[PDB]
Amino acid sequence: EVEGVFVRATVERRCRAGFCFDKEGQGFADGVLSDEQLEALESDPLLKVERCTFSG
Amino acid sequence: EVEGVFVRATVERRCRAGFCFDKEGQGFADGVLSDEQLEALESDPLLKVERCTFSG
Amino acid sequence: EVEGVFVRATVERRCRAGFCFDKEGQGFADGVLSDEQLEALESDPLLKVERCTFSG
Amino acid sequence: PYLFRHYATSDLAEMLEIYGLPIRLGKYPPGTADEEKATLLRAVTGLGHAAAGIIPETMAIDFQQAAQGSSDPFLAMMRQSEDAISKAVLGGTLTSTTSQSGGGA
Amino acid sequence: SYCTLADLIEQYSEQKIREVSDRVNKPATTIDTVIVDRAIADADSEIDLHLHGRYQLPLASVPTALKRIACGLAYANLHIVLKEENPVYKTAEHLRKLLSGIANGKLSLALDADGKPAPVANTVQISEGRNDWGADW
Amino acid sequence: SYCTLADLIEQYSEQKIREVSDRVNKPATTIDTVIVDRAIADADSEIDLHLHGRYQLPLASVPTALKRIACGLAYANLHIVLKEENPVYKTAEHLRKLLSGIANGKLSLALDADGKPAPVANTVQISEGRNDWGADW
Amino acid sequence: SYCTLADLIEQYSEQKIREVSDRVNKPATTIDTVIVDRAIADADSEIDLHLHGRYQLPLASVPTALKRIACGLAYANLHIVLKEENPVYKTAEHLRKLLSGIANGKLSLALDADGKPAPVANTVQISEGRNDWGADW
Amino acid sequence: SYCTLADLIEQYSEQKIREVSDRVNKPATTIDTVIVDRAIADADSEIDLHLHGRYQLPLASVPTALKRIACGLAYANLHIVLKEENPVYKTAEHLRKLLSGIANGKLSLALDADGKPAPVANTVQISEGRNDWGADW
Amino acid sequence: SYCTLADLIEQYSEQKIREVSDRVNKPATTIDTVIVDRAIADADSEIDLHLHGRYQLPLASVPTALKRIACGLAYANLHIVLKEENPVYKTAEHLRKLLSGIANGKLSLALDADGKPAPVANTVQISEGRNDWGADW
């Protein structure tokens, strides 16, 4: 099981091309790959964040 | 810029056609115009408030 | 009404072309225009100054 | 006087926190990648605790003064405030300007 | 890909690109796309060499000055033999001077279409800042 | 767009623009608008490269000196081959010198029509200023 | 408008202005007012570039030296092609040297007709001056 | 008006003034007063540019050296085209060197007829001098 | 192997490679693979000499700029006799200048295909850091 999910329509910093804008991607508290990119992508939320059990 | 939006997907009180509703997230905080009507539109955030400035 | 007048044949620094010489122009204590030029033109009097009510 | 003493004590605590190692700034030439920038930054960050380190001749580290002075001004202010408080509360004959020792009937 | 075959044709006319790109037919008849692609790739590689320390490599947008520089370098690369006094060589040298000025922080990389480029975080780094006793306790 | 085709024609006469812009007809007959547009865009890109650090990029108005500089650079860009001793090259070099002087803070960007340009906030930055105990308590 | 068509004619004779201004008729017949206006505007723009940091831009009066400088620069601008050894180019360079000397505070902008020019308030700025305890209390 | 038409005729002979002033008649017949007046005005404007920081502008008297300098500059201004090796250009350069030496405080402006010129009050300024307790109390 | 025979053919055309590689047949007929391999190996050895102090030797990927540099050096090595003014020699000198700039930390080694190169740990080294009494005891 993976612990870590953000499902409150919450905002996170995801960078597409030359800018970082609101979007929900990985949104997990565990990492095995893309750690250096995840840091920029996984900036903790701006707004209310609540976690669930995807169990994927 | 925009001082604040206070949307959280909820307006304070958007009253139209004689009925007062709660939706469309039209919360503003500024004295640009319609401050007297801004008191009526605002001043009732029943649900939580999340401020995310649009930098307009 | 405008408060500010100098009617004692008093001297004030008015600059015409490359020099500042005695002359009575604006001579008012209120300003809405030509403030930067008025400062040079509205140098407080050299001699006796008395004010009146033009009410223009 | 309480506010004066509070400000002086907080400022002294901050200055004591900054005291110790010097601030040192690293400089890198054009064409230094982000990974090398991060490595230089970590090296500079840990250089104060670490006695020794090596960098390319093209780089540079400058050790600048951190906080040089004394506790004299802060302590002077604290003493002034405390003397004022003592005089106001219990009088300026026994507490602030202490009456000193000396017995007798 | 800061420049394309269309950009090269527009800047130097299709005849010159055909003449300097067709190496097997005399007189030239068609433009060799592979040779042009390699020249453009080499120009982009040189520009990235110059710009790696100040901006992100995989730029999402191409600034116009970057387009001009890439076109010039690509055309200079399409010449098998290039002498010192050839004017194309002088243009390439001027463009390289512009690139060096950009790298040394004397020139700024301009707008792409409406937004700024993406500078790297090289200058951002600071230790962290220890300022306890100053947090309104 | 600091300069237009009208400006180029006015500065260099329509005949010269036709001669240096029409590459497919010999003798030239018409002015190619696409080539002129690309040359003007390249001139604007170079000027923005020079002016990005002192003023806002999307200028709402074009200063007259900027118009002259853009026209000169655009005309210099319309030459496929440009030698060192060509007078047009010397004019381009002088205009680039003017741009560099502006960038280094030795020349000021003049009035557009009646108002000043919009300098960037680079010099404005200061920490904030902590001056408690001095607010008339 | 530091100089006019009358000033150009007076300084360089009407024949030379006609020859360097009429581009469509060979031999020249009339002076093109639009071309002369653009040249004068460009000269004024360059002069303002040089003088923006020491005086107000919209000068209410034109100093005589400014008239001579504007006339020279305008005439130099009316040449489509201007080589380095052309004497008109040398005169333009001398006038630009005069302008640079004025900007660097080595030469003063002279009288317009009888009064001084209007310097900017750049040097005026001082903090404010806190001198309580010295007001005859 | 540091020099007049009489001074120009006396210094350079009436024939040369006629030759360099009459632009409409070939061969020249009369001296154009307007052209000479403009040349003299330009010379005076340049001299004032050089002398504004040390003396008052509207000089009530003309020093003799000023007359010679004005005559030389005015004659140099009457040439539409003036090359570098023209001796008149060299004389103008020498006179400009004299003016620059005067401005930099290496040469003094001589007597006008019997009295000194009028220097400006630039050096006079001092704060005021606070010396209470030293007034024989 | 930063470059291959295909890269050399693409950059310099197959005819020139055949001419400078076939030493036993006159006129040349085939490209000698051994000679080309040795030239490419020598170019790679020189590049490694220049890049050993900043990156790992056995690079897993070849940056594009490295490909261009290797191709140029390999072609320059295929000439038995190379004079100073030969343009190929000048190109080799320019590429060596690029390599030296990379070594001295003025240019960065660009992207290979999408990822960064692998810099060596030369700058990483620090003593260790003794900071007991600061571990939240």
Tab-separated table of N, CA and C in Angstrom, chain F residues 58-111:
chain	number	residue	atom	x	y	z
F	58	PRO	N	7.691	44.149	-22.868
F	58	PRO	CA	6.614	44.579	-23.766
F	58	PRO	C	6.333	46.067	-23.642
F	59	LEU	N	7.221	46.888	-24.199
F	59	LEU	CA	7.032	48.331	-24.158
F	59	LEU	C	5.704	48.705	-24.802
F	60	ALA	N	4.937	49.550	-24.115
F	60	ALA	CA	3.684	50.041	-24.669
F	60	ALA	C	3.892	51.141	-25.703
F	61	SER	N	5.063	51.775	-25.715
F	61	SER	CA	5.374	52.823	-26.674
F	61	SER	C	6.804	52.643	-27.164
F	62	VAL	N	7.071	53.166	-28.355
F	62	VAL	CA	8.358	53.023	-29.025
F	62	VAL	C	9.054	54.385	-29.005
F	63	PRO	N	10.140	54.552	-28.251
F	63	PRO	CA	10.916	55.796	-28.347
F	63	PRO	C	11.526	55.978	-29.731
F	64	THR	N	11.696	57.245	-30.119
F	64	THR	CA	12.149	57.554	-31.473
F	64	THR	C	13.542	56.994	-31.742
F	65	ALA	N	14.462	57.154	-30.788
F	65	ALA	CA	15.787	56.568	-30.944
F	65	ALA	C	15.684	55.067	-31.162
F	66	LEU	N	14.737	54.426	-30.476
F	66	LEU	CA	14.515	53.002	-30.672
F	66	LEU	C	14.062	52.718	-32.098
F	67	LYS	N	13.236	53.599	-32.666
F	67	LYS	CA	12.818	53.436	-34.054
F	67	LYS	C	14.012	53.504	-34.998
F	68	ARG	N	14.879	54.499	-34.811
F	68	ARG	CA	16.049	54.616	-35.679
F	68	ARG	C	16.947	53.387	-35.556
F	69	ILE	N	17.191	52.936	-34.325
F	69	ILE	CA	18.052	51.776	-34.112
F	69	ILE	C	17.450	50.540	-34.769
F	70	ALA	N	16.143	50.339	-34.592
F	70	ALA	CA	15.488	49.178	-35.178
F	70	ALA	C	15.549	49.220	-36.696
F	71	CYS	N	15.328	50.394	-37.291
F	71	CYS	CA	15.398	50.501	-38.744
F	71	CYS	C	16.789	50.148	-39.247
F	72	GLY	N	17.822	50.678	-38.590
F	72	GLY	CA	19.177	50.380	-39.022
F	72	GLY	C	19.509	48.904	-38.914
F	73	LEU	N	19.175	48.294	-37.775
F	73	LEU	CA	19.473	46.877	-37.596
F	73	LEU	C	18.685	46.021	-38.580
F	74	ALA	N	17.420	46.373	-38.828
F	74	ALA	CA	16.617	45.613	-39.774
F	74	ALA	C	17.204	45.686	-41.175
F	75	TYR	N	17.633	46.877	-41.602
F	75	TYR	CA	18.254	46.983	-42.916
F	75	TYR	C	19.537	46.167	-42.979
F	76	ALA	N	20.346	46.212	-41.917
F	76	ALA	CA	21.566	45.413	-41.904
F	76	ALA	C	21.257	43.923	-41.967
F	77	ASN	N	20.120	43.502	-41.407
F	77	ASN	CA	19.755	42.091	-41.421
F	77	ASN	C	19.248	41.628	-42.781
F	78	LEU	N	18.794	42.545	-43.631
F	78	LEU	CA	18.288	42.177	-44.949
F	78	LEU	C	19.393	41.833	-45.935
F	79	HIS	N	20.658	41.980	-45.556
F	79	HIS	CA	21.775	41.627	-46.420
F	79	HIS	C	22.212	40.199	-46.113
F	80	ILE	N	22.143	39.326	-47.119
F	80	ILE	CA	22.564	37.941	-46.930
F	80	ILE	C	24.049	37.885	-46.593
F	81	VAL	N	24.864	38.623	-47.343
F	81	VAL	CA	26.302	38.697	-47.124
F	81	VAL	C	26.657	40.144	-46.821
F	82	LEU	N	27.315	40.367	-45.687
F	82	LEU	CA	27.675	41.704	-45.230
F	82	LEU	C	29.140	41.694	-44.819
F	83	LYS	N	29.967	42.427	-45.556
F	83	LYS	CA	31.388	42.480	-45.266
F	83	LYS	C	31.669	43.507	-44.169
F	84	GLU	N	32.918	43.517	-43.701
F	84	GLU	CA	33.280	44.380	-42.580
F	84	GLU	C	33.292	45.851	-42.980
F	85	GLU	N	33.799	46.166	-44.171
F	85	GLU	CA	33.935	47.556	-44.589
F	85	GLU	C	32.685	48.106	-45.264
F	86	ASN	N	31.621	47.322	-45.373
F	86	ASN	CA	30.374	47.843	-45.911
F	86	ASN	C	29.851	48.944	-44.992
F	87	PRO	N	29.512	50.126	-45.518
F	87	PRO	CA	29.043	51.202	-44.626
F	87	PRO	C	27.808	50.834	-43.824
F	88	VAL	N	26.925	49.996	-44.367
F	88	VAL	CA	25.755	49.564	-43.607
F	88	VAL	C	26.190	48.803	-42.361
F	89	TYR	N	27.249	48.000	-42.481
F	89	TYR	CA	27.781	47.305	-41.315
F	89	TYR	C	28.294	48.294	-40.277
F	90	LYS	N	28.956	49.362	-40.724
F	90	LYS	CA	29.445	50.370	-39.789
F	90	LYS	C	28.293	51.072	-39.081
F	91	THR	N	27.219	51.375	-39.814
F	91	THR	CA	26.049	51.977	-39.182
F	91	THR	C	25.445	51.038	-38.149
F	92	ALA	N	25.361	49.748	-38.477
F	92	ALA	CA	24.860	48.776	-37.511
F	92	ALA	C	25.743	48.735	-36.271
F	93	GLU	N	27.064	48.788	-36.457
F	93	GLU	CA	27.973	48.786	-35.314
F	93	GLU	C	27.778	50.023	-34.449
F	94	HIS	N	27.599	51.188	-35.070
F	94	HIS	CA	27.353	52.400	-34.293
F	94	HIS	C	26.059	52.287	-33.496
F	95	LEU	N	25.004	51.756	-34.117
F	95	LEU	CA	23.743	51.594	-33.400
F	95	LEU	C	23.886	50.605	-32.249
F	96	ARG	N	24.638	49.523	-32.458
F	96	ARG	CA	24.889	48.580	-31.373
F	96	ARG	C	25.673	49.241	-30.248
F	97	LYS	N	26.602	50.135	-30.596
F	97	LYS	CA	27.322	50.891	-29.578
F	97	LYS	C	26.369	51.770	-28.779
F	98	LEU	N	25.414	52.406	-29.460
F	98	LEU	CA	24.403	53.189	-28.755
F	98	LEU	C	23.601	52.309	-27.802
F	99	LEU	N	23.209	51.121	-28.264
F	99	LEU	CA	22.453	50.206	-27.414
F	99	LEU	C	23.263	49.792	-26.192
F	100	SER	N	24.540	49.470	-26.393
F	100	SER	CA	25.390	49.078	-25.273
F	100	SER	C	25.553	50.224	-24.287
F	101	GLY	N	25.708	51.449	-24.792
F	101	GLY	CA	25.771	52.597	-23.906
F	101	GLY	C	24.502	52.764	-23.093
F	102	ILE	N	23.348	52.527	-23.718
F	102	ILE	CA	22.089	52.584	-22.978
F	102	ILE	C	22.066	51.516	-21.890
F	103	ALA	N	22.482	50.294	-22.229
F	103	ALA	CA	22.426	49.202	-21.264
F	103	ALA	C	23.322	49.473	-20.061
F	104	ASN	N	24.520	50.005	-20.297
F	104	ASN	CA	25.470	50.288	-19.230
F	104	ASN	C	25.157	51.572	-18.472
F	105	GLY	N	23.978	52.155	-18.673
F	105	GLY	CA	23.591	53.315	-17.898
F	105	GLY	C	24.344	54.581	-18.227
F	106	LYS	N	24.896	54.692	-19.434
F	106	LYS	CA	25.546	55.924	-19.865
F	106	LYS	C	24.630	56.793	-20.713
F	107	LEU	N	23.620	56.195	-21.339
F	107	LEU	CA	22.605	56.913	-22.089
F	107	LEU	C	21.231	56.539	-21.549
F	108	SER	N	20.311	57.493	-21.595
F	108	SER	CA	18.950	57.282	-21.131
F	108	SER	C	18.032	57.045	-22.319
F	109	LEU	N	17.039	56.183	-22.126
F	109	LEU	CA	16.029	55.963	-23.150
F	109	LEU	C	15.080	57.158	-23.168
F	110	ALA	N	14.980	57.818	-24.315
F	110	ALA	CA	14.330	59.115	-24.386
F	110	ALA	C	12.811	58.979	-24.273
F	111	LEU	N	12.137	60.109	-24.458
F	111	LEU	CA	10.684	60.162	-24.434
F	111	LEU	C	10.109	59.372	-25.606
